[PDB]
Amino acid sequence: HAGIFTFEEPVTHVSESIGIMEVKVLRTSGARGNVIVPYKTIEGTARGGGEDFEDTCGELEFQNDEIVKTISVKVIDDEEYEKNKTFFLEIGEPRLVEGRPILGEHTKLEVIIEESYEFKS
């Protein structure tokens, strides 16, 4: 009953102008105990280091009876263009804080950054 942890979905589209992207991690099928879920960003065709996004990583702590947490990623509205602009988040194996918590269905998330174009009326 410690929980099965998952992203909402495996692929998401966000605007280049979103500013802050808030990625959810859900705990399903049990919320007993304090658990951490490691996470990280990984570059795809989109670049980190504040080019298209700011890299981030850490451990999300779920307290007893807590079932949703948020990872906030800075998305930079890069003036430069790609046909398909992607990066990823991943969750890693959960750990009890000193049953067993595990990963569920969506453990990798592809983020597609959608580009918009400036036209004048």
Q: 80 among the known binding-site residues?
A: yes
CA atoms within 13 A on the CB side of 71: 27
**Is 79 annotated to bind ligand?**
yes
Q: How many CA atoms lie within 13 A of 26 on its CB side?
A: 9
Q: What share of the chain is helix, strand, coil (3-state, %, to 5)?
A: 0, 50, 50
Contact 77, 16 (CB under 8 A): yes
Q: What count of other Cβ atoms lies within 10 Å of the Cβ of residue 69?
A: 17
Residue 93 annotated as binding site: no
43 marked among binding-site residues: no
Binding-site residue set: 16, 52, 78-80, 115
Binding-site residue set for Ca(2+): 16, 52, 78-80, 115
